[PDB]
Amino acid sequence: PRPLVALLDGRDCTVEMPILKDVATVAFCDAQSTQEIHEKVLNEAVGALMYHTITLTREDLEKFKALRIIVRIGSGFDNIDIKSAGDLGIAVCNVPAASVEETADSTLCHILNLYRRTTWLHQALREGTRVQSVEQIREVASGAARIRGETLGIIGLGRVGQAVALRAKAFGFNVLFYDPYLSDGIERALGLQRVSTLQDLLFHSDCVTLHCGLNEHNHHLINDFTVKQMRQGAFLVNTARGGLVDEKALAQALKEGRIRGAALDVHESEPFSFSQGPLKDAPNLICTPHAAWYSEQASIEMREEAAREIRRAITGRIPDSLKNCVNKDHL
Amino acid sequence: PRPLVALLDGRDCTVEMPILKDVATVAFCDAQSTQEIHEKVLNEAVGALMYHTITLTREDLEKFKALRIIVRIGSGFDNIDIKSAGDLGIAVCNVPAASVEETADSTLCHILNLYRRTTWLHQALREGTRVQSVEQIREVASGAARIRGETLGIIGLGRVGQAVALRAKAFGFNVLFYDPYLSDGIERALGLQRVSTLQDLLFHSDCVTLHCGLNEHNHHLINDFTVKQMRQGAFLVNTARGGLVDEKALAQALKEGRIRGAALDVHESEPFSFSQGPLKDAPNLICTPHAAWYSEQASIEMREEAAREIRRAITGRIPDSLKNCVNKDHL
């Protein structure tokens, strides 16, 4: 027969079918937890495709008896224990840049929304606020600032980070970044300022934007400690990973006024909701349901790509046939 | 004594005082209509400073017996009959570019908000909408599109228009403009595509943004007729003047789905309100209280500039001492 491949936290396989039809048996679990995965999958599944709504711990992975590959349909793979999966002889792959630009564009939208207060002005206009005179325009739009000369501090100058830096220049932002893993000289190639430490970046930035993956070393990068290093009344943007920020610290900082405002597309606990979590009633906070990456073309693109990776894996050799394996070291 | 100068539709003169103290007698009317202006002003006022919340018709101007100059504290001067004022020997001046960039930045914010649906996703998140699965992200974020390759059609390649074009390139927008008053060749200097007619621009643009002043020839530039020339499901942005768009036509087009969405910072009838006007319940519509221009620095900048113009006028000669007179022809 043809190897079984399962879509863990999803139920739509229309885009992948044309590509896997003759080489695999497609199936979906639409699971909201690993406990929701059926026995037949854990026993026979050779490949697996998953999104970000489900986590896979070592315990989870050990329950698969034939799993040979897990392809993340997206960028981040922090929801998967690449290490354990590797030891278990399970190759983990992702989809690197199908939405790099969708993400940079949303990032810029958040940045501008904080500086120009577009969303808040609209939200207030819906609240019935009246704005007839200039004095009232100034009051309702209070805080809107002139962007030219502001310092945008980027944390993580990777694919998205670079796309953000380039867009940022056009608005007159002075751009500087921090990324301890990059080789020296990239800052010269793109004409950007680089700093050696996080505190350095935080201290000189008027607006801080996260663009690094969530790893074993940056959990809660933004702490009650580091938040204290940020400028007074600085903006914070995060379209990377919720786990990079300690919402409790952020909430406090937002109430005290230390941070003028934050735009978050990702949160420590997703699904996100204003009714619960440390961000409840937190002042000047704009949120989005983790859609920074979305655009129909990108969704379609990343799915056909994930599908092809599965195909290469089933028809070729692991990890030789794979194009985006992220745990070769543990294999 | 020192000539009387009055602030028509406003009541704050703190920023102008330091500059006019020894050469003029400051006063304010905080008028919401010309009928609200007091007799002493119409009789003795030599200079006048005004915003955009009040209109001045020929009838209005003729009621001044000593008015020698009117300085608009801002960019647009369509609310003033420059022609009549000129015939009445009244010089009209404005403040050209104190907020050029604030405006371009808001314009970009609106453009991105339509493409990335940041504001709507946030507004829905407040409505209690739940977004836990990928399928739901795709549904709630439906319509968010990949910007690269989209055609941004700019109408009016002046100060703001140019700032918008430059920012737009960085997002991968193919930029093209229409501006029948510019000399030939500006498109070569900035590396942009230019078209000869409005229909031309409208037909090839995925997103249309207005950046022209409101004049005797473009009232309701966007009509039931011209709207029909726009692409199917095109976006419309307007941070220029409300009078450039026939809200009735826009409303219809928005309901029928011909126009996927619109972002308006200006409206035919300001103060704007969702409770009244042709835009009531109009689908996919984002609005702002005419704050595209605001930033404390710009507000301060334009006021000290207007103040200096008044000073030059009172201490020098009209229209020789003026730096930004917009009705020299009628003088």
Ligand SMILES: NC(=O)c1ccc[n+]([C@@H]2O[C@H](COP(=O)([O-])OP(=O)(O)OC[C@H]3O[C@@H](n4cnc5c(N)ncnc54)[C@H](O)[C@@H]3O)[C@@H](O)[C@H]2O)c1
């Ligand atoms: N909100 C969304 O829908 C969305 C969209 C795209 C990507 N993701 C987020 O963005 C990340 C991927 O970005 P790319 O930009 O696609 O990734 P890359 O292309 O993986 O870039 C990430 C960069 O982060 C740097 N980095 C790691 N740890 C760091 C630290 N402690 N300090 C500073 N820099 C650090 C790396 O060295 C690397 O250059 C994902 O891991 C995820 O968190 C989310």
Ligand SMILES: NC(=O)c1ccc[n+]([C@@H]2O[C@H](COP(=O)([O-])OP(=O)(O)OC[C@H]3O[C@@H](n4cnc5c(N)ncnc54)[C@H](O)[C@@H]3O)[C@@H](O)[C@H]2O)c1
């Ligand atoms: N929303 C706000 O707060 C805000 C902020 C700044 C300016 N204003 C708006 O923007 C205008 C000023 O822009 P600039 O960009 O400052 O002005 P300019 O610098 O006066 O530019 C306007 C351009 O419009 C062009 N134009 C006139 N009629 C046209 C037509 N029918 N078709 C195409 N182009 C046409 C002109 O030739 C000119 O190049 C004002 O008149 C006003 O309507 C509003």
